[PDB]
Amino acid sequence: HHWGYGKHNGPEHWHKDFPIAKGERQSPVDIDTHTAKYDPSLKPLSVSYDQATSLRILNNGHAFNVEFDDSQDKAVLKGGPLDGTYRLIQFHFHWGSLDGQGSEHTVDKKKYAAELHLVHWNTKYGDFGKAVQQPDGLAVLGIFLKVGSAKPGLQKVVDVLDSIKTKGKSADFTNFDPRGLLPESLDYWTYPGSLTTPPLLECVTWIVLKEPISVSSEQVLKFRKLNFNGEGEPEELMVDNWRPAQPLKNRQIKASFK
Numbered sequence: 001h002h003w004g005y006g007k008h009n010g011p012e013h014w015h016k017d018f019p020i021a022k023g024e025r026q027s028p029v030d031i032d033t034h035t036a037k038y039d040p041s042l043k044p045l046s047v048s049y050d051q052a053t054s055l056r057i058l059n060n061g062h063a064f065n066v067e068f069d070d071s072q073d074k075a076v077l078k079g080g081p082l083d084g085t086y087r088l089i090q091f092h093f094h095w096g097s098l099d100g101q102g103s104e105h106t107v108d109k110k111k112y113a114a115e116l117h118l119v120h121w122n123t124k125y126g127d128f129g130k131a132v133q134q135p136d137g138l139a140v141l142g143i144f145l146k147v148g149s150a151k152p153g154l155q156k157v158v159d160v161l162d163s164i165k166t167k168g169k170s171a172d173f174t175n176f177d178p179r180g181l182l183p184e185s186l187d188y189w190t191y192p193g194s195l196t197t198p199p200l201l202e203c204v205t206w207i208v209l210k211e212p213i214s215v216s217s218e219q220v221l222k223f224r225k226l227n228f229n230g231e232g233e234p235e236e237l238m239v240d241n242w243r244p245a246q247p248l249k250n251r252q253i254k255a256s257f258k
Protein backbone atom coordinates (compact mmCIF):
# COMPACT_ATOMS: atom_id res chain seq x y z
CA HIS A 1 0.00 0.00 0.00
CA HIS A 2 2.47 2.65 -1.10
CA TRP A 3 1.71 6.23 -2.09
CA GLY A 4 0.20 7.28 -5.36
CA TYR A 5 -2.60 9.46 -6.72
CA GLY A 6 -5.89 7.49 -5.92
CA LYS A 7 -8.71 7.70 -3.25
CA HIS A 8 -6.91 5.39 -0.98
CA ASN A 9 -3.32 6.50 -1.42
CA GLY A 10 -3.42 10.05 -2.97
CA PRO A 11 -2.10 13.45 -1.70
CA GLU A 12 -4.50 13.58 1.21
CA HIS A 13 -2.95 10.35 2.64
CA TRP A 14 0.72 11.19 2.22
CA HIS A 15 1.21 12.86 5.64
CA LYS A 16 0.87 9.39 7.41
CA ASP A 17 4.07 8.10 5.78
CA PHE A 18 5.59 11.54 5.18
CA PRO A 19 4.66 13.91 8.06
CA ILE A 20 6.53 16.82 6.47
CA ALA A 21 3.51 16.86 4.06
CA LYS A 22 1.99 19.28 6.63
CA GLY A 23 5.30 21.34 6.88
CA GLU A 24 6.05 25.04 6.67
CA ARG A 25 7.40 25.19 3.14
CA GLN A 26 5.32 22.67 1.08
CA SER A 27 4.78 22.84 -2.72
CA PRO A 28 2.99 23.48 -4.99
CA VAL A 29 1.19 26.76 -4.08
CA ASP A 30 -1.26 29.13 -5.59
CA ILE A 31 0.58 32.13 -7.08
CA ASP A 32 -1.53 35.19 -6.25
CA THR A 33 -0.20 37.62 -8.94
CA HIS A 34 -1.45 40.71 -7.20
CA THR A 35 0.41 39.86 -3.96
CA ALA A 36 3.74 38.64 -5.53
CA LYS A 37 6.12 41.53 -5.10
CA TYR A 38 8.32 42.66 -7.95
CA ASP A 39 11.93 42.37 -6.69
CA PRO A 40 14.39 44.59 -8.64
CA SER A 41 17.26 42.70 -6.93
CA LEU A 42 16.35 39.48 -8.79
CA LYS A 43 18.50 38.58 -11.81
CA PRO A 44 17.56 37.28 -15.26
CA LEU A 45 17.49 33.50 -15.09
CA SER A 46 20.45 31.82 -16.79
CA VAL A 47 19.48 28.56 -18.53
CA SER A 48 22.45 26.95 -20.24
CA TYR A 49 21.29 23.74 -21.90
CA ASP A 50 23.33 23.68 -25.16
CA GLN A 51 25.47 20.71 -23.85
CA ALA A 52 22.69 18.76 -22.16
CA THR A 53 23.09 14.98 -22.55
CA SER A 54 19.90 12.97 -22.14
CA LEU A 55 20.36 9.19 -21.49
CA ARG A 56 17.06 7.51 -20.88
CA ILE A 57 13.39 7.78 -20.27
CA LEU A 58 11.61 5.85 -17.52
CA ASN A 59 7.98 5.17 -16.45
CA ASN A 60 8.36 5.09 -12.60
CA GLY A 61 4.69 4.34 -11.95
CA HIS A 62 3.88 8.04 -11.04
CA ALA A 63 5.15 9.94 -14.11
CA PHE A 64 7.87 9.48 -16.80
CA ASN A 65 11.38 10.94 -16.20
CA VAL A 66 13.78 12.01 -18.95
CA GLU A 67 17.15 11.53 -17.22
CA PHE A 68 20.40 13.35 -17.98
CA ASP A 69 24.07 12.61 -17.53
CA ASP A 70 24.91 15.05 -14.72
CA SER A 71 28.50 13.74 -14.23
CA GLN A 72 30.02 16.74 -15.97
CA ASP A 73 29.44 20.45 -15.95
CA LYS A 74 26.90 20.56 -18.81
CA ALA A 75 23.25 21.72 -18.49
CA VAL A 76 23.08 24.31 -15.71
CA LEU A 77 20.74 26.73 -14.18
CA LYS A 78 22.03 29.87 -12.42
CA GLY A 79 21.27 33.54 -11.70
CA GLY A 80 17.67 34.38 -11.08
CA PRO A 81 17.20 34.03 -7.32
CA LEU A 82 20.00 31.42 -7.11
CA ASP A 83 23.41 31.62 -5.54
CA GLY A 84 25.78 29.37 -7.39
CA THR A 85 25.24 26.63 -9.98
CA TYR A 86 22.60 23.90 -10.29
CA ARG A 87 22.97 20.95 -12.65
CA LEU A 88 20.05 19.39 -14.59
CA ILE A 89 19.39 15.76 -13.58
CA GLN A 90 15.89 15.04 -15.00
CA PHE A 91 12.62 16.42 -16.13
CA HIS A 92 9.08 15.12 -15.90
CA PHE A 93 5.52 16.40 -16.13
CA HIS A 94 2.30 16.36 -14.14
CA TRP A 95 -0.99 16.29 -16.03
CA GLY A 96 -4.73 15.86 -15.87
CA SER A 97 -7.51 13.54 -16.98
CA LEU A 98 -9.02 16.62 -18.75
CA ASP A 99 -7.56 19.86 -20.16
CA GLY A 100 -9.07 21.89 -17.21
CA GLN A 101 -6.64 20.47 -14.65
CA GLY A 102 -3.21 18.98 -14.32
CA SER A 103 -0.81 21.69 -13.15
CA GLU A 104 0.54 21.66 -9.59
CA HIS A 105 1.13 25.41 -9.22
CA THR A 106 -1.88 27.55 -10.02
CA VAL A 107 -1.98 31.28 -10.99
CA ASP A 108 -4.79 33.23 -9.34
CA LYS A 109 -6.41 29.76 -8.91
CA LYS A 110 -6.12 29.02 -12.65
CA LYS A 111 -5.11 25.39 -13.32
CA TYR A 112 -3.16 24.61 -16.52
CA ALA A 113 -3.46 21.37 -18.51
CA ALA A 114 0.00 20.18 -17.27
CA GLU A 115 3.26 21.35 -15.75
CA LEU A 116 6.85 20.50 -16.68
CA HIS A 117 9.48 20.32 -13.88
CA LEU A 118 13.17 20.61 -14.91
CA VAL A 119 15.00 19.39 -11.82
CA HIS A 120 18.49 20.66 -10.90
CA TRP A 121 20.78 20.12 -7.92
CA ASN A 122 23.23 22.51 -6.32
CA THR A 123 26.76 21.54 -7.30
CA LYS A 124 28.05 22.70 -3.87
CA TYR A 125 26.59 19.42 -2.48
CA GLY A 126 28.36 17.05 -4.89
CA ASP A 127 25.28 15.01 -5.90
CA PHE A 128 21.50 14.88 -5.91
CA GLY A 129 21.15 12.56 -2.91
CA LYS A 130 23.12 14.91 -0.66
CA ALA A 131 21.55 17.99 -2.19
CA VAL A 132 17.94 16.95 -1.26
CA GLN A 133 18.99 17.07 2.46
CA GLN A 134 19.69 20.83 2.24
CA PRO A 135 17.31 23.87 2.21
CA ASP A 136 19.01 25.25 -0.93
CA GLY A 137 19.75 21.86 -2.47
CA LEU A 138 17.48 21.89 -5.58
CA ALA A 139 16.17 24.43 -8.10
CA VAL A 140 13.14 23.26 -10.00
CA LEU A 141 12.13 25.23 -13.08
CA GLY A 142 8.36 24.87 -13.54
CA ILE A 143 6.69 25.55 -16.89
CA PHE A 144 2.96 25.47 -17.48
CA LEU A 145 1.41 23.68 -20.48
CA LYS A 146 -1.80 24.76 -22.20
CA VAL A 147 -3.57 22.96 -25.00
CA GLY A 148 -3.52 24.65 -28.44
CA SER A 149 -0.71 24.58 -30.96
CA ALA A 150 1.61 21.56 -30.96
CA LYS A 151 5.10 21.93 -29.40
CA PRO A 152 7.45 20.53 -32.02
CA GLY A 153 10.25 20.11 -29.45
CA LEU A 154 8.03 17.80 -27.40
CA GLN A 155 7.23 15.33 -30.19
CA LYS A 156 10.31 13.15 -29.60
CA VAL A 157 9.14 12.54 -26.04
CA VAL A 158 5.51 11.82 -27.14
CA ASP A 159 6.62 9.29 -29.66
CA VAL A 160 8.63 7.09 -27.26
CA LEU A 161 5.77 6.79 -24.71
CA ASP A 162 4.23 3.73 -26.36
CA SER A 163 7.53 1.95 -25.58
CA ILE A 164 7.32 2.67 -21.79
CA LYS A 165 3.58 2.25 -21.26
CA THR A 166 3.76 0.54 -17.85
CA LYS A 167 5.50 1.03 -14.50
CA GLY A 168 9.18 0.04 -14.53
CA LYS A 169 9.72 0.18 -18.31
CA SER A 170 12.57 2.31 -19.68
CA ALA A 171 14.14 3.12 -23.09
CA ASP A 172 17.46 4.71 -24.16
CA PHE A 173 16.62 8.36 -25.02
CA THR A 174 19.70 10.17 -26.19
CA ASN A 175 20.24 13.52 -27.86
CA PHE A 176 17.03 15.10 -26.59
CA ASP A 177 17.37 18.89 -26.42
CA PRO A 178 15.36 20.42 -23.58
CA ARG A 179 15.75 23.95 -25.05
CA GLY A 180 12.85 22.99 -27.31
CA LEU A 181 10.54 22.92 -24.23
CA LEU A 182 11.16 26.55 -23.12
CA PRO A 183 8.77 29.47 -23.75
CA GLU A 184 10.13 32.79 -25.25
CA SER A 185 10.16 34.75 -22.02
CA LEU A 186 12.07 33.72 -18.88
CA ASP A 187 9.98 36.07 -16.63
CA TYR A 188 9.31 34.13 -13.42
CA TRP A 189 7.95 33.93 -9.87
CA THR A 190 10.08 32.36 -7.13
CA TYR A 191 9.54 31.05 -3.61
CA PRO A 192 11.11 28.51 -1.21
CA GLY A 193 9.30 25.14 -1.31
CA SER A 194 9.55 21.36 -1.44
CA LEU A 195 9.41 18.28 -3.65
CA THR A 196 5.82 17.78 -4.71
CA THR A 197 5.97 13.99 -4.33
CA PRO A 198 7.11 11.90 -1.38
CA PRO A 199 9.54 12.25 0.29
CA LEU A 200 8.22 15.91 0.07
CA LEU A 201 11.63 17.29 1.30
CA GLU A 202 11.87 21.05 1.91
CA CYS A 203 14.88 21.50 -0.33
CA VAL A 204 13.64 23.41 -3.36
CA THR A 205 13.94 26.95 -4.73
CA TRP A 206 10.99 27.02 -7.05
CA ILE A 207 11.26 29.13 -10.23
CA VAL A 208 7.91 29.16 -12.07
CA LEU A 209 7.85 30.77 -15.54
CA LYS A 210 4.95 33.12 -16.21
CA GLU A 211 4.69 32.24 -19.94
CA PRO A 212 3.14 28.79 -20.60
CA ILE A 213 4.09 26.68 -23.58
CA SER A 214 1.36 25.35 -25.90
CA VAL A 215 1.04 21.64 -26.68
CA SER A 216 -1.56 19.99 -28.90
CA SER A 217 -4.54 17.98 -27.79
CA GLU A 218 -2.92 14.93 -29.52
CA GLN A 219 0.32 15.38 -27.56
CA VAL A 220 -1.41 15.53 -24.15
CA LEU A 221 -3.71 12.62 -25.19
CA LYS A 222 -0.59 10.44 -25.57
CA PHE A 223 0.51 11.36 -21.97
CA ARG A 224 -2.88 10.08 -20.88
CA LYS A 225 -2.39 6.66 -22.52
CA LEU A 226 0.44 5.86 -20.06
CA ASN A 227 -0.24 3.47 -17.23
CA PHE A 228 0.42 3.70 -13.46
CA ASN A 229 0.25 -0.13 -13.20
CA GLY A 230 2.98 -2.60 -14.35
CA GLU A 231 2.81 -4.95 -17.35
CA GLY A 232 0.26 -7.74 -16.93
CA GLU A 233 -1.69 -5.78 -14.35
CA PRO A 234 -5.20 -4.31 -14.67
CA GLU A 235 -4.97 -1.06 -16.48
CA GLU A 236 -4.99 2.23 -14.53
CA LEU A 237 -4.44 5.25 -16.79
CA MET A 238 -1.66 7.58 -15.73
CA VAL A 239 -3.75 10.80 -15.28
CA ASP A 240 -4.19 13.35 -12.49
CA ASN A 241 -0.68 12.75 -11.11
CA TRP A 242 -0.58 16.27 -9.57
CA ARG A 243 -0.53 17.45 -5.92
CA PRO A 244 -3.04 20.31 -5.20
CA ALA A 245 -1.91 23.72 -3.93
CA GLN A 246 -0.65 23.73 -0.28
CA PRO A 247 -0.80 26.49 2.39
CA LEU A 248 1.62 29.40 1.65
CA LYS A 249 2.19 29.99 5.44
CA ASN A 250 5.05 32.29 6.21
CA ARG A 251 6.31 32.73 2.59
CA GLN A 252 6.60 35.55 0.02
CA ILE A 253 6.41 34.84 -3.68
CA LYS A 254 8.69 37.24 -5.64
CA ALA A 255 8.28 38.34 -9.26
CA SER A 256 11.20 38.96 -11.58
CA PHE A 257 9.08 41.41 -13.72
CA LYS A 258 6.92 44.48 -13.54
Ligand SMILES: NS(=O)(=O)c1ccc(Nc2ncnc(Cl)c2[N+](=O)[O-])cc1
Binds near residue numbers: 128194199
Ligand atom coordinates in the same frame (compact mmCIF):
# COMPACT_ATOMS: atom_id res chain seq x y z
N1 LIG B 1 7.73 17.01 -8.55
S1 LIG B 1 9.22 17.70 -8.14
O1 LIG B 1 8.99 18.49 -6.92
O2 LIG B 1 9.83 18.40 -9.31
C1 LIG B 1 10.26 16.39 -7.71
C2 LIG B 1 9.81 15.46 -6.79
C3 LIG B 1 10.59 14.38 -6.42
C4 LIG B 1 11.84 14.23 -6.98
N2 LIG B 1 12.60 13.12 -6.59
C5 LIG B 1 13.79 12.69 -7.28
N3 LIG B 1 14.15 13.20 -8.49
C6 LIG B 1 15.16 12.75 -9.23
N4 LIG B 1 15.79 11.67 -8.84
C7 LIG B 1 15.50 11.05 -7.73
CL1 LIG B 1 16.57 9.71 -7.49
C8 LIG B 1 14.43 11.49 -6.88
N5 LIG B 1 13.94 10.85 -5.63
O3 LIG B 1 13.90 11.65 -4.76
O4 LIG B 1 13.67 9.74 -5.95
C9 LIG B 1 12.31 15.11 -7.96
C10 LIG B 1 11.52 16.24 -8.28
Ligand SMILES: [Zn+2]
Binds near residue numbers: 093196
Ligand atom coordinates in the same frame (compact mmCIF):
# COMPACT_ATOMS: atom_id res chain seq x y z
ZN1 LIG C 1 7.28 17.42 -10.47
